[PDB]
């Protein structure tokens, strides 16, 4: 019901409110954000509810509050390769990941849940997705914000994948279960995968190519054998890169 998982992060309300204030103070934003209203919309999603009975509609006021005008042709999805995807967006700073948006920035690496009959936050334990229930506050949030993120994408979407994993593309991950199935074909022309270390011939990548192609979206794939060199030339493309993109 509420156990088997880590509890809500200590000082979670202060943290969410502090993150919103800092995100807005470094992003003169589409529409002024009253961070207090944002925290209230966050709280209203899960407070005083069964933490196994959370729905996506519970989070829609927070989603509406947190809608941002993101350049849709600059979205980098990723699946289970966290550090390189975000360091890539620190350099190619015209491209965004889900954690670079307001809503992703707010909840990144946090846990939360409430209790049915009380207005309190449970800092002791929260429903674990696998062993208690799937419709818990944290999982439902990310399942919701990731769907809307994919729905906003346009013109060419890139996704970074870990080629060292035995399942380079996992159909059961958020990218496979939610994001891929929600790219709008009338807005998205191509999904280009970047496999990080020829693994574009891996059975799981061809599965991603099949799934995407039957939604009438083009598939593209690109091996990256030299990640550190690939990033070095994103910083400064002017030294030695048009001959060194080869199998190391």
């Amino acid at each position, epitope marked *: 019901q509420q156990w088997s998982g880590p509890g809500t992060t200590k000082r979670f309300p202060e943290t969410v409110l502090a993150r919103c204030v800092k995100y807005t103070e470094i992003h003169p934003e589409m529409r002024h954000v009253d961070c207090q209203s944002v925290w209230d919309a966050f709280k209203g999603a899960f407070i005083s509810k069964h933490p196994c009975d959370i729905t996506e509609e519970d989070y829609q006021p927070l989603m509406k509050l947190g809608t941002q005008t993101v350049p849709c042709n600059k979205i980098l999805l990723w699946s289970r390769i966290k550090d390189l995807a975000h360091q890539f967006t620190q350099v190619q700073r015209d491209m965004f990941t889900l954690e670079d948006t307001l809503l992703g920035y707010l909840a990144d690496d946090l846990t939360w849940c409430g209790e049915f009959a009380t207005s309190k936050i449970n800092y002791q334990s929260c429903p674990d997705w696998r062993k208690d229930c799937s419709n818990n506050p944290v999982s439902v949030f990310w399942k919701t914000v990731s769907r809307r993120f994919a729905e906003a994408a346009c013109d*060419v979407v890139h996704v970074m994948l870990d080629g060292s994993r035995s399942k380079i593309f996992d159909k059961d991950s958020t990218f496979g279960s939610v994001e891929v199935h929600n790219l709008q074909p009338e807005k998205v022309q191509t999904l280009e995968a970047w496999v990080i270390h020829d693994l574009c011939q891996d059975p799981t990548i061809k599965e991603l190519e099949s799934i995407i192609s039957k939604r009438n979206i*083009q598939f593209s794939c690109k091996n990256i054998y030299r990640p550190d060199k690939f990033l070095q030339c994103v910083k400064n493309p002017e030294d030695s890169s*048009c001959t060194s993109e080869i199998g190391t």
Partner: antibody, heavy 122, light 108 residues
Framework: EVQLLESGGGLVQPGGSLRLSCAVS????????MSWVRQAPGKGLEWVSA????????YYADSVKGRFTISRDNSKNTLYLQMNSLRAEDTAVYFC???????????????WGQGTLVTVSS | EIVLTQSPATLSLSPGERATLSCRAS??????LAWYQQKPGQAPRLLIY???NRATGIPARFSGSGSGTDFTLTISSLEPEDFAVYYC?????????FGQGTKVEIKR
């Protein structure tokens, strides 16, 4: 060093077909998007079509959207432009261009071929 | 599509003079603006990309400035060898578009 060498092209009747080739060397063809840019006689540059490094993703200019097909054979380092239903207004010098960006998207071109003239005439 | 307007159509300068070339986008491309040099009978040569970055091997007399809709190419110490048509090209969205070009002719 990088080299883009276009072949094919010449004289073709209105309504006929022509396939262009672009043989490349000096870079990893697989990991770069390619595009075709054309230049009518005494006119400016007009982007025709773009294709991803692996070939799956393609974009087309509206004027050729139903008649041109971009493609590539990465095992031969060759780019193709399959042109059908050619009209007089397709008469132009056709360049192949290499995307400078390290991924598929709105391109900027750092390497060009020498171009090959296509004449659509009776 | 995004329309790129270059002014003037022709510019006749003397060597050693400063060349100022304009490109005005019909809507904001914000940085995604390249500059290309095309000498007679030749393929274009990328001078500036993303509105301010010199490509490899491009002389320091070529400089790009601008953001949004107003962009400028400057050639500080013009040479007879600089007789070419210069094109601006945007990569803000699809399709990528070029301006009609400015022809720099050298006085003598």
């Amino acid at each position: 060093e990088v080299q883009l060498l276009e072949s094919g092209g010449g004289l073709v009747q209105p309504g006929g077909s022509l396939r262009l080739s672009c043989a490349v060397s000096g870079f990893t063809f697989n990991s770069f998007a390619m595009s075709w840019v054309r230049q009518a006689p005494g006119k400016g540059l007009e982007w025709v079509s773009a294709i991803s490094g692996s070939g799956g993703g393609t974009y087309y200019a509206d004027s050729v959207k139903g008649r041109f097909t971009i493609s590539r054979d990465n095992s031969k380092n060759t780019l193709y432009l399959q042109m059908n239903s050619l009209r007089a207004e397709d008469t132009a010098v056709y360049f192949c261009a290499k995307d400078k960006i390290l991924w598929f998207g709105e391109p900027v071109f750092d390497y060009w071929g020498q171009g090959t003239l296509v004449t659509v005439s009776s | 599509e995004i329309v790129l307007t270059q002014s003037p159509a022709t510019l006749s300068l003397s060597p050693g003079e400063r060349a100022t070339l304009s490109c005005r986008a019909s809507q904001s491309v914000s940085s995604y603006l390249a500059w290309y040099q095309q000498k007679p009978g030749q393929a274009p040569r990328l001078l500036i990309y993303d509105a301010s970055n010199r490509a490899t091997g491009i002389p320091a007399r070529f400089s790009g400035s601008g953001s949004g809709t107003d962009f400028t190419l400057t050639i500080s110490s013009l040479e007879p060898e600089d007789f070419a048509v210069y094109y601006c090209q945007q990569r803000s969205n699809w399709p990528p578009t070029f301006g009609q070009g400015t022809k720099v002719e050298i006085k003598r």
